[PDB]
Amino acid sequence: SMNPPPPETSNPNKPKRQTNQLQYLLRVVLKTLWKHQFAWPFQQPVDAVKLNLPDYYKIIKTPMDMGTIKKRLENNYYWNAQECIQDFNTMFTNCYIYNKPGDDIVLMAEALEKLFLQKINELPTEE
Numbered sequence: 001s002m003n004p005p006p007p008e009t010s011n012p013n014k015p016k017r018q019t020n021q022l023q024y025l026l027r028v029v030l031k032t033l034w035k036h037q038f039a040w041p042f043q044q045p046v047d048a049v050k051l052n053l054p055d056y057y058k059i060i061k062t063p064m065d066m067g068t069i070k071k072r073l074e075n076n077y078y079w080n081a082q083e084c085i086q087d088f089n090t091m092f093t094n095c096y097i098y099n100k101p102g103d104d105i106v107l108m109a110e111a112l113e114k115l116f117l118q119k120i121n122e123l124p125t126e127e
């Protein structure tokens with residue numbers, strides 16, 4: 001039932017970087033995905049309590065949402081783009097794992113992933 005602590009968005013020990021690839025992930029990719037009509041269910045951690053999904057965090061052991069990714073990019077938490085791209089891929093994969101094919105949330109995830117792949121193909125080379 002109980003919601004776990006959200007994923008870490010702050011860690012003063014962890015060394016941080018501002019790269020053009022990370023600037024692109026915030027300014028181009030996240031901005032595009034966040035404003036999409038199907039973004040809202042992905043903008044915050046799954047609230048298992050509110051949704052009465054006591055199973056959710058029994059099945060999903062690496063939760064991720066765009067709220068966390070947004071916080072991680074705004075607060076320069078990442079070392080490289082691969083870390084941030086992994087977070088997006090975890091958010092999509094968690095959706096496909098927990099939910100059934102054809103479910104509304106999976107159709108929303110599929111739309112968002114398509115856009116995400118488009119923008120990631122155009123990832124700038126490291127400056």
Ligand SMILES: Cc1cc(-c2nc3ccccc3n2CC2CCOCC2)cn(C)c1=O
Binds near residue numbers: 042095105
């Ligand atoms: C299982 C699940 C639920 C939601 C979710 N978050 C909601 C917030 C408020 C209200 C409903 C919420 N849901 C359920 C879906 C919302 C969109 O339509 C399908 C149900 C999001 N994701 C990524 C999931 O994997």
